Structure 1
Amino acid sequence: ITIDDAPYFSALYGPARHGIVVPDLSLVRPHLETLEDCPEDLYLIEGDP
C-alpha cells in the first residue's frame, strides 16, 4: 500500500493490524487450547487470503 493510504489503514485496523487472516475460524477452535506461546493478544480474521 502507498504512503497516502498507509495512515488511514493503520488507524482503521488499530490493534488488529498484525492479526492473521483465516477463512473459517472454526478449524482453529481445536488447535487453540495448545497456544501457550504467542503474543498476549492474538487477532484472527476471516476472509479470502
Structure 2
Amino acid sequence: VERDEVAAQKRELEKQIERLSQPSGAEDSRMIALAERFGGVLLSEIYDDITIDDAPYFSALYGPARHGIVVPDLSLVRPHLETLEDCPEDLYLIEGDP
C-alpha cells in the first residue's frame, strides 16, 4: 500500500512536470496550434520574460485568460470556430498586436 501510494504521488509529479515542460506555457496543443490556425500567439509567451515579481500580478490580472491567446482579429477566428470540438473545454481569444 505504501509503495502504491508513493507510485501515485510520483505519477502525479511526472504528469505535472510535463504540464510545465514545453514549449512556452503549459504545452504545445490546441493553444499553440492557434498560433498557426490564426496568428494566435500565446499570451503567456507574449510575456515570456515577465519578472517573477510582476508574474503574480500578471497571472492574477489575466485570470483564466492567463493562458489566453492574442489574435488581432477574433471575428476572423469565427470561420474556423466550428472546427474546435477537440479544444480545451473553454478557450480564450484576445484582440491586439501580439
TM-score range, shorter chain: over 0.9
* Unmatched runs of 5 consecutive residues or more in structure 1: none
Residue 84 of structure 2 corresponds to 35
SS at structure 1 position matched to 2:97: coil
Cα deviation code 1:1-49 (max 9, x no counterpart): 1111111111111100001110011111110011111001100000001
Higher helix share: 2
Percent of counterpart pairs with the same letter? 100
**Alpha-carbon separation, structure 2, partners of 1:4 and 1:28:** 34
Residue 4 of structure 1 corresponds to 53
Paired residues in the alignment total 49
Work out whether 1:21 is the aligned partner of 2:70.
yes
Q: Which has the larger radius of gyration?
A: 2
* Unmatched runs of 5 consecutive residues or more in structure 2: 1-49
Give the TM-score normalised by structure 2: 0.49
Of the two structures, which has the highest relative contact order with CA contacts closer than 8 Å and spacing of 6 or more?
A: 1
Runs of 4+ in 1 over 4 A off after TM superposition: none
Q: CA RMSD in A?
A: 0.6
